[PDB]
């Protein structure tokens, strides 16, 4: 009779109960204690300016109306018995477009206790915008937010609270991060207020830091174009007399940075203003621009002032490895020290 | 306190029925309007449409809603929208649409002791807008947003906007990547259609493209590859293999942007100002190279005169493009 | 270049109103994080309120209640109206931008920051 007794206890505890109303409707507010464990950090799109995230989302609150006395001091409730009692409506004020999983079964949970608790877990997949300020780029770091509060409670009804430390309120699986060109650093936790044309509400933030990882566009990009430049100004050091073979040698170092500026920008996604990685590129093309045009000018001087074109040529092959060094310290000590 | 609240509500939704408007029968109910913009974003040239996150909300009264002996604002569970009368709005240039249901559907309702109904809901949409791209990538748009009731006309629902021109908020706080908001606008108007008029209310932005993503590029490259073809007229004439491949492999570069260009842009069959520029673009280039051409077949009979060609080419071809490059900014910005 | 300029302050008689204002120039702060800060003579630098683009508001937990802050977008600024104020508010209130990486309630993530503006209250 065990099981008819537990039965008459669930058909007697929504006798007289309406799930349209918050507890403590007109006489106290409704604290809800919120944490939130993260089972994988997922990719994050430059492009679209948003990541995405999974979740189990946990949320505590107290109902005297669901008071019960019984052998068992806590209950746990299939999930057809928790959309009939009244749920805190929460929402994610950055969210684009979120799942709640119920394969094969809603990933729904709630638990009773006899003094009235009631715990409440999800699972959900969270597609939020990061807007990013990408001058730094690929040498930059951001900070991705992620808000949620009630949609429809002021704050003078529902408020919002961290189960412990706010520190240790937020917890990332150690296999959490599936990211292939960020490193997650770590995250803050917050608590704010908002206010809209409805009203003032509480709202709960965490805030999550990246920095990008830069060895592909090192080995992808900035090496071929070192490479390149060193290759154009090795023409210096071919005789004067094969003028052909120094235009050849230096229009094809032309046309090689001219393709690898090409290749760099696809990837890039299209933002008004100029990375590094656009002055890098630019300085890189200008190094060889500046090259051709220096033996166009040894050519235009050759046969008749041949000791003013080898003087040039004895200095050039100083001053050009000299500048793209100075280059490449001013260049590498101004976005990696940041 | 809480049980005569319940017994309040309940008998509110006795004898409730959803299928008659308010003052059905009679005068006209007043519905009023407020969008609170939250992100504009995913400006499609090749969809031609945009999409739009938003804090839609309605008010009107409806008396058989009133209540007295509690003073204070119900706000109701969202599932009891279901057992009331909610306007039958919608969006007429709407491709897709939803409201968010993350952890529960984005949906509120607020009641007043006089009857006054609020409803909200948090709806992101795909509008679509026709684009005229004839001045691309120099060209400014207006996308609007039409708001009509599908079911009632004007003898049974009326729109207007709840505070005048601040019943829109949040157009100044959107950064669009690519774009600028110039302004919006509201309009209210009526359609007279087949079975009869109908309240509409519109909301429109006008934009105006940014330019520097296509000028780092899109034109500097072209820029540079028409600087490039100059650099035959300063090599010896003698030297046929260096000149033939600098103005062969200008050629292909040239046409290998053009033809990837028209391969990634939106296709967009009429004339853009892109198009000239790429066009005029490879009209220098055939013409520098057309100049060696020149030079080729008349540098044994008058080397003089060939010479003189080349010379004059050093000034001609720098000031016709610099010409052409202030006749198309001029006649575009 | 970029400067945030500051108005307001000045002398207080241990109560009132007091609306700090500050405006920003030579870039669009609309997708950053504008706060404020407060710094009492030679003491530490503390954070006292700031808020986001998403207008979400946060203060410190010493300020809340008294201090609000606000942004006109429009303008491109930001105000503090400072209520019920005290003699130990005697400081120097500071305008600050930032992208908030590693904390906005840490001052050492902010990239911009004001001239300051001499808050006194006499009592």
């Known amino acids: 009779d065990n099981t008819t007794v537990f039965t008459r206890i669930l058909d007697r505890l929504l006798d007289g109960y309406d799930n349209r109303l918050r507890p403590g409707l007109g006489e106290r507010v409704t604290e809800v204690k919120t944490d939130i464990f993260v089972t994988s950090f997922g990719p994050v799109s430059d492009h679209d300016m948003e990541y995405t995230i999974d979740v189990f989302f946990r949320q505590s609150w107290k109902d005297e109306r669901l008071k019960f006395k019984g052998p068992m001091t806590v209950l746990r409730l299939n999930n057809l018995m928790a959309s009939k009692i009244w749920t805190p409506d929460t929402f994610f004020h950055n969210g684009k477009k979120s799942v709640a999983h119920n394969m094969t079964m809603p990933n729904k949970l709630l638990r009773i206790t006899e003094d009235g608790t009631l715990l409440y877990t999800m699972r959900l997949t969270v597609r939020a915008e990061c807007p990013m300020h990408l001058e730094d780029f690929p040498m930059d770091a951001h900070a991705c937010p992620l808000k949620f509060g009630s949609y429809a409670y002021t704050r003078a009804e529902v408020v919002y609270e961290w189960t412990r430390e706010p520190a240790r309120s937020v917890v990332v699986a150690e296999d959490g991060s599936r990211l292939n060109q960020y490193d997650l650093l770590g995250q803050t936790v917050d608590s704010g207020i908002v206010q809209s044309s409805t009203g003032e509400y509480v709202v709960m933030t965490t805030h999550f830091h990246l920095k990008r990882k830069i060895g592909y566009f090192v080995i992808q990009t900035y090496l071929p174009c070192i490479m390149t430049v060193i290759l154009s100004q090795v023409s210096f050091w071919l005789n004067r007399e094969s003028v052909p073979a120094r235009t050849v040698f230096g229009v094809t170092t032309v046309l090689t940075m001219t393709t690898l500026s090409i290749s760099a920008r696809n990837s890039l996604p299209k933002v008004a203003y100029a990375t590094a990685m656009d002055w890098f590129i630019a300085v890189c093309y200008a190094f060889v621009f500046s090259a051709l045009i220096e033996f166009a000018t040894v050519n235009y001087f050759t046969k008749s002032q041949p000791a003013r074109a080898a003087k040039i040529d004895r200095l050039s092959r100083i001053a050009f490895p000299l500048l793209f060094g100075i280059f490449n310290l001013v260049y590498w000590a101004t976005y990696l020290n940041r | 306190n809480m049980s005569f609240v319940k017994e309040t509500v309940d008998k509110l939704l006795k004898g409730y029925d959803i299928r008659l408007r308010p003052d059905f029968g009679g005068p006209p109910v007043c519905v009023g309007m407020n969008i609170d913009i939250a992100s504009i974003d995913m400006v499609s040239e090749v969809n031609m449409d945009y999409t739009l996150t938003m804090y839609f909300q309605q008010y009107w009264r409806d008396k058989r809603l009133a209540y007295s002996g509690i003073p204070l604002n119900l706000t109701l569970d969202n599932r009891v929208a279901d057992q009331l009368w909610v306007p039958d709005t919608y969006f007429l240039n709407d491709k897709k649409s939803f409201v968010h249901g993350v952890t529960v559907k984005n949906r509120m309702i607020r009641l007043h002791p006089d009857g006054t109904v609020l409803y909200g809901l948090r709806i992101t949409t795909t509008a679509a807008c026709m684009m005229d791209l004839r001045r691309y990538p120099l060209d400014e748009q207006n996308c609007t947003l039409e708001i009509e009731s599908y079911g009632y006309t004007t003898d049974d629902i009326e729109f207007y906007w709840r505070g005048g021109d601040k019943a829109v908020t949040g157009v100044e706080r959107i950064e669009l990547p690519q774009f600028s908001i110039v302004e919006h606008r509201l309009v209210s108007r009526n359609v007279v259609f087949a079975t009869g008029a109908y309240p509409r209310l519109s909301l429109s932005f006008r934009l105006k493209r940014n330019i520097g993503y296509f000028i780092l590029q899109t034109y500097m490259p072209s820029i540079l590859i028409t600087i490039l073809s100059w650099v035959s007229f300063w090599i010896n004439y003698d030297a046929s293999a260096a000149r033939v491949a600098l103005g062969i492999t200008t050629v292909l570069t040239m046409t290998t942007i053009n033809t990837h260009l028209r391969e990634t842009l939106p296709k967009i069959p009429y004339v853009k100002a892109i198009d000239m520029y790429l066009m005029g673009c490879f009209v220098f280039v055939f013409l520098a190279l057309l100049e060696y051409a020149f030079v080729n077949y008349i540098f044994f009979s008058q080397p003089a005169r060939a010479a003189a060609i080349d010379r004059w080419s050093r000034i001609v071809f720098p000031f016709t493009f610099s010409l052409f490059n202030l006749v198309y900014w001029l006649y575009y910005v | 270049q970029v400067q945030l300029q500051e108005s307001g302050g000045g002398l207080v008689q241990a109560g009132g109103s007091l609306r700090v204002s500050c405006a920003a120039s030579?870039?669009?702060?609309?997708?950053?994080?504008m706060a404020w800060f407060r710094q009492a003579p030679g003491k530490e630098r503390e954070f006292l309120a700031a808020?986001?683009?998403?207008?979400?508001?946060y203060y410190g937990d010493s300020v809340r209640g008294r201090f609000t802050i606000s942004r006109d977008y429009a303008k491109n600024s930001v105000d503090l109206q400072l209520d019920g104020l005290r003699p130990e508010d005697t400081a120097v209130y500071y305008c600050?931008?930032?992208?908030?990486?590693?904390?906005?309630?840490?001052?050492?993530?902010?990239?911009?920051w004001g001239q300051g503006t001499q808050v006194t209250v006499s009592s």
């Open positions: 808020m986001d683009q998403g207008r979400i508001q």
């Open positions: 030579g870039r669009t702060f609309t997708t950053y994080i």
């Open positions: 600050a931008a930032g992208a908030g990486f590693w904390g906005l309630r840490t001052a050492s993530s902010y990239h911009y």
